[PDB]
Amino acid sequence: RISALPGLNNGQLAEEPLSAYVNALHDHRLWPPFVTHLPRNMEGVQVVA
Amino acid sequence: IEYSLPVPFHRFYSNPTICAALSDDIKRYVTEFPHYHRHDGGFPLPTAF
Amino acid sequence: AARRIPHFYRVRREVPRTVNEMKQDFVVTDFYKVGNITLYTELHPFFDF
Amino acid sequence: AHEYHNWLRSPFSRYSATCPNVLHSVMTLAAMLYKISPVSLVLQTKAHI
């Protein structure tokens, strides 16, 4: 709740919500250190083994 | 979950998460537009409402 | 209406915000500034345009 | 070991290394993840943060 400004995160400019532009917790390019499922959104992100 | 039908019809009483759980169309719609997953209103009521 | 709620969200397309909703966007300080495009509408305390 | 191409750099661990174990340090790690970009600047400034 803190991380995304709910009073201003109301829109898009790319095919991404504004809340992704303001806080890293909200965009899909940053991953959590531990994964058990792959994410739904992986447009420009590519994963390397 | 099979006999229940969601109806977002008010500024209150229009939680996106519940109505996304209850119907697959609203699930697709919310995944398209994550910025609509918000509770200050702003989540688009249908054209009749 | 209750049955055609899904038909509205079937259309994977965005909706415009109302000027009242876009007007709530502004903090008390900068509601009066030139950056508030919605000011041309705030004509009457008791009526919205 | 690629620090300079990483997302979280050394000041993050330098903070979490001594922060007290209360909710406020969690919220602080979150607010530190605010992105710095023109879009993020306007979103933070319009909120007067």
XYZ file of N, CA and C in Angstrom:
588
model
N 0.822 -1.205 0.000
C 0.000 0.000 0.000
C 0.856 1.255 0.000
N 1.906 1.270 0.818
C 2.802 2.429 0.856
C 3.482 2.642 -0.492
N 4.008 1.568 -1.087
C 4.968 1.731 -2.180
C 4.370 2.405 -3.415
N 3.115 2.130 -3.755
C 2.492 2.713 -4.938
C 1.544 3.825 -4.526
N 1.716 5.006 -5.106
C 0.816 6.115 -4.808
C -0.558 5.833 -5.397
N -1.549 5.420 -4.604
C -2.846 5.074 -5.192
C -3.617 6.274 -5.690
N -3.280 7.479 -5.232
C -3.926 8.680 -5.717
C -3.387 9.206 -7.024
N -2.294 8.630 -7.529
C -1.739 9.062 -8.802
C -1.331 7.924 -9.726
N -1.380 6.667 -9.294
C -0.961 5.544 -10.124
C -2.026 5.116 -11.121
N -2.997 5.979 -11.381
C -4.170 5.690 -12.193
C -3.973 5.884 -13.689
N -3.141 5.069 -14.326
C -3.019 5.155 -15.766
C -1.876 4.307 -16.280
N -1.585 4.500 -17.564
C -0.493 3.834 -18.257
C 0.212 4.862 -19.127
N 1.462 4.581 -19.498
C 2.039 5.348 -20.595
C 2.679 4.424 -21.628
N 3.359 3.383 -21.185
C 3.591 2.234 -22.045
C 2.513 1.210 -21.697
N 2.619 -0.014 -22.177
C 1.668 -1.015 -21.707
C 2.002 -1.493 -20.301
N 2.191 -0.543 -19.387
C 2.609 -0.727 -18.013
C 1.892 0.288 -17.135
N 1.453 -0.108 -15.947
C 0.818 0.852 -15.047
C 1.816 1.867 -14.522
N 1.303 3.046 -14.170
C 2.171 4.097 -13.658
C 2.879 3.661 -12.385
N 2.226 2.832 -11.567
C 2.839 2.355 -10.329
C 4.117 1.582 -10.609
N 4.213 0.960 -11.784
C 5.468 0.342 -12.189
C 6.554 1.380 -12.421
N 6.177 2.594 -12.831
C 7.169 3.622 -13.124
C 7.702 4.273 -11.857
N 6.953 4.210 -10.763
C 7.342 4.941 -9.565
C 8.121 4.078 -8.574
N 7.753 2.815 -8.395
C 8.408 1.987 -7.393
C 8.813 0.669 -8.025
N 10.022 0.206 -7.699
C 10.547 -1.010 -8.312
C 9.768 -2.240 -7.884
N 9.152 -2.202 -6.703
C 8.351 -3.333 -6.252
C 7.194 -3.603 -7.201
N 6.816 -2.612 -8.011
C 5.610 -2.731 -8.822
C 5.882 -3.031 -10.287
N 7.120 -2.917 -10.754
C 7.350 -3.347 -12.123
C 7.812 -4.801 -12.171
N 7.654 -5.412 -13.342
C 7.922 -6.832 -13.507
C 9.370 -7.130 -13.851
N 10.173 -6.107 -14.131
C 11.564 -6.329 -14.506
C 12.408 -6.722 -13.307
N 12.078 -6.199 -12.131
C 12.737 -6.636 -10.911
C 12.125 -7.943 -10.434
N 12.942 -8.896 -10.185
C 12.460 -10.169 -9.683
C 12.782 -10.315 -8.202
N 11.993 -11.095 -7.460
C 12.389 -11.437 -6.099
C 13.599 -12.349 -6.110
N 14.416 -12.332 -5.052
C 15.615 -13.182 -5.039
C 15.321 -14.670 -5.153
N 14.186 -15.132 -4.640
C 13.797 -16.534 -4.695
C 12.566 -16.679 -5.572
N 12.582 -17.669 -6.456
C 11.476 -17.918 -7.367
C 11.011 -19.354 -7.208
N 9.697 -19.540 -7.227
C 9.108 -20.863 -7.383
C 8.166 -20.964 -8.566
N 7.624 -19.854 -9.061
C 6.881 -19.796 -10.309
C 7.467 -18.693 -11.176
N 7.402 -18.886 -12.477
C 7.823 -17.828 -13.375
C 6.718 -16.781 -13.504
N 7.069 -15.535 -13.797
C 6.072 -14.467 -13.787
C 5.257 -14.437 -15.068
N 4.067 -13.851 -14.951
C 3.204 -13.733 -16.115
C 3.808 -12.789 -17.146
N 4.317 -11.646 -16.698
C 4.793 -10.594 -17.582
C 6.306 -10.672 -17.718
N 6.767 -10.956 -18.935
C 8.187 -11.051 -19.242
C 8.492 -10.457 -20.609
N 7.983 -9.259 -20.898
C 8.122 -8.704 -22.240
C 9.575 -8.515 -22.654
N 10.268 -7.572 -22.025
C 11.656 -7.329 -22.361
C 12.631 -8.096 -21.520
N 12.132 -8.727 -20.460
C 12.964 -9.521 -19.569
C 13.236 -10.874 -20.207
N 14.506 -11.265 -20.250
C 14.882 -12.592 -20.709
C 15.709 -13.273 -19.630
N 15.441 -14.558 -19.423
C 16.017 -15.338 -18.337
C 17.072 -16.264 -18.913
N 18.215 -16.345 -18.240
C 19.357 -17.103 -18.730
C 19.730 -18.168 -17.716
N 19.611 -19.422 -18.118
C 20.415 -20.497 -17.568
C 21.506 -20.826 -18.577
N -18.430 -21.219 -6.270
C -17.742 -20.500 -7.332
C -18.372 -20.731 -8.700
N -19.154 -21.798 -8.865
C -19.839 -22.025 -10.132
C -21.232 -21.424 -10.172
N -21.869 -21.239 -9.019
C -23.225 -20.713 -8.961
C -23.273 -19.231 -8.634
N -22.130 -18.601 -8.385
C -22.074 -17.205 -7.980
C -21.806 -16.316 -9.184
N -22.371 -15.113 -9.149
C -22.282 -14.178 -10.252
C -21.911 -12.807 -9.703
N -20.801 -12.221 -10.135
C -20.404 -10.921 -9.593
C -21.174 -9.788 -10.247
N -21.363 -8.685 -9.534
C -21.963 -7.507 -10.153
C -21.370 -6.247 -9.531
N -20.349 -5.657 -10.149
C -19.861 -4.356 -9.680
C -20.778 -3.230 -10.129
N -21.408 -2.546 -9.175
C -22.466 -1.598 -9.485
C -22.406 -0.288 -8.715
N -21.386 -0.055 -7.892
C -21.349 1.118 -7.033
C -19.897 1.567 -6.889
N -19.684 2.767 -6.339
C -18.324 3.182 -6.004
C -17.740 2.280 -4.931
N -18.511 2.026 -3.880
C -18.271 0.905 -2.987
C -18.750 -0.340 -3.726
N -18.645 -1.503 -3.103
C -19.285 -2.701 -3.641
C -18.909 -2.939 -5.104
N -17.640 -2.700 -5.428
C -17.107 -2.977 -6.755
C -15.652 -3.418 -6.673
N -15.319 -4.224 -5.677
C -13.948 -4.664 -5.472
C -13.459 -5.405 -6.709
N -12.383 -4.953 -7.359
C -11.910 -5.658 -8.558
C -11.454 -7.080 -8.298
N -10.869 -7.361 -7.132
C -10.291 -8.684 -6.907
C -11.372 -9.752 -6.819
N -12.461 -9.457 -6.112
C -13.535 -10.428 -5.949
C -14.205 -10.714 -7.286
N -14.574 -9.661 -8.015
C -15.263 -9.863 -9.282
C -14.331 -10.427 -10.348
N -13.019 -10.245 -10.193
C -12.079 -10.927 -11.074
C -12.005 -12.410 -10.750
N -12.068 -12.760 -9.464
C -12.104 -14.166 -9.082
C -13.370 -14.847 -9.589
N -14.501 -14.143 -9.552
C -15.772 -14.778 -9.882
C -15.983 -14.959 -11.382
N -15.395 -14.115 -12.224
C -15.597 -14.226 -13.664
C -14.269 -14.182 -14.401
N -14.176 -14.957 -15.479
C -12.935 -15.018 -16.245
C -12.745 -13.795 -17.135
N -13.833 -13.191 -17.618
C -13.699 -11.974 -18.417
C -13.113 -10.827 -17.603
N -13.585 -10.634 -16.371
C -13.017 -9.570 -15.550
C -11.587 -9.908 -15.158
N -11.260 -11.196 -15.034
C -9.869 -11.579 -14.803
C -8.979 -11.155 -15.967
N -9.399 -11.453 -17.201
C -8.628 -11.015 -18.362
C -8.526 -9.496 -18.404
N -9.634 -8.814 -18.125
C -9.668 -7.360 -18.198
C -8.700 -6.739 -17.201
N -8.683 -7.253 -15.970
C -7.788 -6.715 -14.953
C -6.340 -7.043 -15.278
N -6.064 -8.226 -15.834
C -4.689 -8.514 -16.235
C -4.229 -7.618 -17.382
N -5.139 -7.221 -18.273
C -4.772 -6.261 -19.312
C -4.359 -4.926 -18.719
N -5.104 -4.449 -17.732
C -4.965 -3.094 -17.210
C -4.779 -3.162 -15.704
N -3.561 -3.442 -15.249
C -3.308 -3.511 -13.804
C -3.625 -2.226 -13.069
N -3.589 -1.080 -13.750
C -3.908 0.176 -13.085
C -5.381 0.255 -12.704
N -6.236 -0.563 -13.328
C -7.640 -0.613 -12.929
C -7.852 -1.429 -11.667
N -6.862 -2.211 -11.260
C -6.930 -2.944 -10.008
C -6.739 -1.970 -8.851
N -7.713 -1.090 -8.632
C -7.609 -0.061 -7.610
C -8.971 0.152 -6.961
N -8.947 0.645 -5.720
C -10.122 0.637 -4.851
C -10.599 2.023 -4.443
N -10.092 3.077 -5.063
C -10.594 4.421 -4.821
C -11.768 4.774 -5.715
N -12.485 3.783 -6.225
C -13.309 3.999 -7.392
C -12.409 3.739 -8.575
N -12.613 4.430 -9.684
C -11.658 4.302 -10.765
C -11.736 2.997 -11.529
N -12.100 1.907 -10.857
C -12.358 0.665 -11.562
C -13.631 0.840 -12.373
N -13.581 0.690 -13.693
C -14.713 1.093 -14.531
C -15.949 0.248 -14.283
N -16.994 0.899 -13.787
C -18.305 0.281 -13.760
C -18.813 0.111 -15.191
N -19.674 -0.875 -15.441
C -20.217 -1.054 -16.789
C -20.995 0.165 -17.259
N -21.238 0.208 -18.572
C -21.823 1.393 -19.189
C -23.185 1.730 -18.597
N -23.925 0.725 -18.135
C -25.218 0.983 -17.520
C -25.089 1.625 -16.147
N -23.940 1.493 -15.488
C -23.746 2.030 -14.149
C -22.789 3.213 -14.099
N -28.889 -6.568 -17.168
C -27.640 -5.979 -16.692
C -26.760 -7.005 -15.990
N -27.330 -7.748 -15.039
C -26.528 -8.675 -14.249
C -25.890 -9.755 -15.111
N -26.566 -10.176 -16.173
C -26.027 -11.194 -17.061
C -25.015 -10.644 -18.048
N -25.158 -9.386 -18.449
C -24.264 -8.788 -19.426
C -23.164 -7.956 -18.781
N -22.989 -8.053 -17.459
C -21.753 -7.559 -16.845
C -20.513 -8.125 -17.532
N -20.389 -9.440 -17.764
C -19.199 -9.940 -18.478
C -19.019 -9.389 -19.883
N -20.106 -9.090 -20.591
C -19.980 -8.584 -21.954
C -19.300 -7.221 -22.002
N -19.409 -6.430 -20.931
C -18.741 -5.132 -20.899
C -17.233 -5.295 -20.785
N -16.791 -6.162 -19.877
C -15.368 -6.396 -19.690
C -14.796 -7.281 -20.784
N -15.660 -7.875 -21.608
C -15.196 -8.669 -22.740
C -14.363 -7.826 -23.693
N -14.720 -6.552 -23.841
C -14.032 -5.630 -24.741
C -12.754 -5.177 -24.040
N -11.611 -5.635 -24.542
C -10.318 -5.402 -23.911
C -9.830 -3.978 -24.142
N -10.623 -2.981 -23.764
C -10.298 -1.607 -24.101
C -10.521 -0.713 -22.892
N -9.803 0.403 -22.870
C -9.742 1.294 -21.724
C -10.915 2.275 -21.743
N -11.098 2.983 -20.632
C -12.211 3.922 -20.499
C -11.660 5.274 -20.061
N -12.282 6.382 -20.456
C -11.851 7.687 -19.948
C -12.305 7.931 -18.520
N -11.476 8.651 -17.772
C -11.857 9.097 -16.443
C -12.766 10.317 -16.525
N -13.685 10.416 -15.575
C -14.532 11.593 -15.502
C -13.727 12.781 -14.993
N -14.170 13.981 -15.362
C -13.460 15.181 -14.943
C -13.513 15.344 -13.431
N -14.572 14.859 -12.783
C -14.596 14.881 -11.323
C -13.498 13.989 -10.757
N -13.326 12.807 -11.345
C -12.289 11.886 -10.895
C -10.896 12.435 -11.179
N -10.685 12.984 -12.376
C -9.399 13.608 -12.679
C -9.171 14.837 -11.810
N -10.250 15.430 -11.297
C -10.146 16.617 -10.463
C -9.741 16.269 -9.039
N -10.115 15.085 -8.548
C -9.651 14.682 -7.220
C -8.140 14.500 -7.169
N -7.485 14.457 -8.330
C -6.061 14.152 -8.427
C -5.186 15.155 -7.683
N -5.651 16.387 -7.507
C -4.776 17.485 -7.118
C -4.794 17.753 -5.620
N -3.596 17.928 -5.061
C -3.441 18.342 -3.676
C -3.981 19.759 -3.508
N -4.362 20.093 -2.271
C -4.937 21.404 -1.975
C -4.036 22.527 -2.461
N -2.720 22.336 -2.387
C -1.799 23.403 -2.764
C -1.862 23.696 -4.258
N -1.803 22.660 -5.086
C -1.666 22.835 -6.521
C -2.979 22.684 -7.275
N -4.104 22.619 -6.565
C -5.406 22.704 -7.216
C -5.607 24.061 -7.872
N -5.035 25.111 -7.295
C -5.189 26.469 -7.788
C -4.179 26.829 -8.861
N -3.143 26.024 -9.045
C -2.088 26.362 -9.981
C -2.563 26.151 -11.411
N -1.794 26.701 -12.351
C -2.136 26.607 -13.762
C -2.136 25.159 -14.235
N -1.423 24.276 -13.538
C -1.356 22.881 -13.927
C -2.655 22.121 -13.796
N -3.666 22.710 -13.165
C -4.973 22.078 -12.994
C -5.832 22.392 -14.211
N -5.817 21.489 -15.194
C -6.599 21.705 -16.408
C -8.095 21.675 -16.119
N -8.508 21.028 -15.028
C -9.931 20.918 -14.720
C -10.515 22.198 -14.132
N -9.703 23.235 -13.922
C -10.210 24.477 -13.343
C -11.257 25.150 -14.218
N -11.142 25.028 -15.539
C -12.105 25.673 -16.425
C -13.524 25.177 -16.194
N -13.684 24.108 -15.419
C -14.975 23.509 -15.124
C -15.541 23.920 -13.770
N -14.686 24.231 -12.795
C -15.098 24.544 -11.426
C -15.739 25.934 -11.341
N -16.984 26.028 -11.815
C -17.632 27.330 -11.922
C -18.531 27.679 -10.740
N -19.021 26.695 -9.985
C -20.039 26.932 -8.972
C -19.791 26.006 -7.798
N -19.859 26.490 -6.558
C -19.697 25.571 -5.423
C -20.721 24.455 -5.403
N -21.964 24.757 -5.755
C -23.065 23.828 -5.570
C -23.352 22.964 -6.788
N -22.722 23.231 -7.927
C -23.026 22.537 -9.169
C -21.731 22.118 -9.840
N -21.721 20.941 -10.457
C -20.560 20.553 -11.242
C -20.885 20.626 -12.725
N -19.869 20.944 -13.512
C -19.998 21.086 -14.947
C -19.070 20.080 -15.606
N 28.948 -11.507 -8.869
C 29.526 -10.332 -8.223
C 29.274 -9.009 -8.937
N 28.404 -8.993 -9.942
C 28.200 -7.801 -10.768
C 27.371 -6.744 -10.033
N 28.032 -6.017 -9.129
C 27.332 -4.987 -8.362
C 26.809 -3.878 -9.254
N 27.638 -3.393 -10.176
C 27.301 -2.147 -10.848
C 26.160 -2.309 -11.840
N 25.918 -3.524 -12.326
C 24.756 -3.826 -13.149
C 23.597 -4.387 -12.347
N 23.696 -4.387 -11.023
C 22.664 -4.939 -10.164
C 21.574 -3.909 -9.883
N 20.474 -4.390 -9.309
C 19.321 -3.558 -8.981
C 19.432 -2.941 -7.587
N 19.804 -3.738 -6.587
C 20.044 -3.256 -5.231
C 21.544 -3.245 -4.974
N 22.075 -2.080 -4.626
C 23.499 -1.898 -4.410
C 23.803 -1.890 -2.917
N 25.077 -1.689 -2.591
C 25.622 -1.804 -1.243
C 24.928 -0.956 -0.178
N 24.456 0.265 -0.462
C 23.745 1.007 0.594
C 22.522 0.286 1.133
N 21.866 -0.549 0.324
C 20.730 -1.317 0.822
C 21.141 -2.230 1.966
N 22.169 -3.055 1.747
C 22.638 -3.943 2.805
C 23.287 -3.168 3.931
N 23.890 -2.025 3.623
C 24.461 -1.199 4.673
C 23.381 -0.693 5.614
N 22.183 -0.426 5.089
C 21.068 -0.046 5.948
C 20.520 -1.254 6.692
N 20.143 -2.303 5.958
C 19.507 -3.457 6.585
C 20.438 -4.166 7.558
N 21.744 -3.901 7.472
C 22.701 -4.517 8.384
C 22.512 -4.064 9.825
N 22.006 -2.848 10.041
C 21.843 -2.326 11.395
C 20.444 -1.821 11.721
N 19.505 -1.846 10.783
C 18.178 -1.318 11.054
C 17.502 -2.121 12.162
N 16.764 -1.472 13.059
C 16.011 -2.225 14.061
C 14.893 -3.017 13.413
N 14.541 -4.131 14.046
C 13.651 -5.120 13.446
C 12.181 -4.814 13.678
N 11.743 -3.613 13.317
C 10.366 -3.185 13.480
C 9.780 -2.965 12.089
N 8.456 -2.790 12.021
C 7.776 -2.583 10.744
C 8.332 -1.391 9.975
N 8.820 -0.371 10.684
C 9.272 0.830 9.998
C 10.477 0.558 9.114
N 11.363 -0.354 9.511
C 12.476 -0.689 8.632
C 11.996 -1.402 7.373
N 10.927 -2.190 7.471
C 10.338 -2.802 6.283
C 9.805 -1.724 5.345
N 9.045 -0.776 5.898
C 8.516 0.307 5.075
C 9.636 1.158 4.494
N 10.750 1.285 5.211
C 11.873 2.068 4.709
C 12.577 1.366 3.558
N 12.806 0.057 3.673
C 13.324 -0.687 2.528
C 12.402 -0.545 1.328
N 11.091 -0.466 1.564
C 10.179 -0.271 0.440
C 10.305 1.115 -0.173
N 10.341 2.160 0.653
C 10.406 3.515 0.124
C 11.748 3.800 -0.530
N 12.794 3.079 -0.133
C 14.078 3.200 -0.808
C 14.007 2.665 -2.230
N 13.048 1.783 -2.513
C 12.900 1.233 -3.857
C 12.117 2.142 -4.795
N 11.873 3.394 -4.418
C 11.307 4.358 -5.353
C 12.273 4.626 -6.496
N 11.791 4.468 -7.724
C 12.632 4.649 -8.894
C 12.909 6.128 -9.119
N 14.055 6.430 -9.729
C 14.391 7.805 -10.084
C 14.374 7.922 -11.603
N 13.410 8.690 -12.097
C 13.143 8.880 -13.514
C 12.206 10.068 -13.644
N 12.115 10.686 -14.826
C 11.212 11.839 -14.951
C 9.774 11.526 -14.584
N 9.270 10.359 -14.991
C 7.905 9.977 -14.641
C 7.774 9.837 -13.131
N 8.725 9.142 -12.512
C 8.701 8.985 -11.065
C 8.863 10.319 -10.356
N 9.672 11.224 -10.912
C 9.796 12.544 -10.305
C 8.474 13.296 -10.324
N 7.761 13.297 -11.454
C 6.507 14.049 -11.480
C 5.485 13.400 -10.558
N 5.468 12.065 -10.499
C 4.485 11.398 -9.653
C 4.758 11.665 -8.179
N 6.032 11.691 -7.783
C 6.370 12.015 -6.400
C 6.125 13.487 -6.085
N 6.424 14.387 -7.024
C 6.305 15.812 -6.735
C 4.850 16.254 -6.678
N 4.010 15.748 -7.584
C 2.588 16.063 -7.514
C 1.975 15.584 -6.209
N 2.542 14.536 -5.612
C 2.096 14.080 -4.303
C 2.757 14.858 -3.172
N 3.682 15.765 -3.494
C 4.385 16.588 -2.510
C 5.218 15.753 -1.549
N 5.693 14.610 -2.031
C 6.672 13.786 -1.336
C 8.061 14.311 -1.664
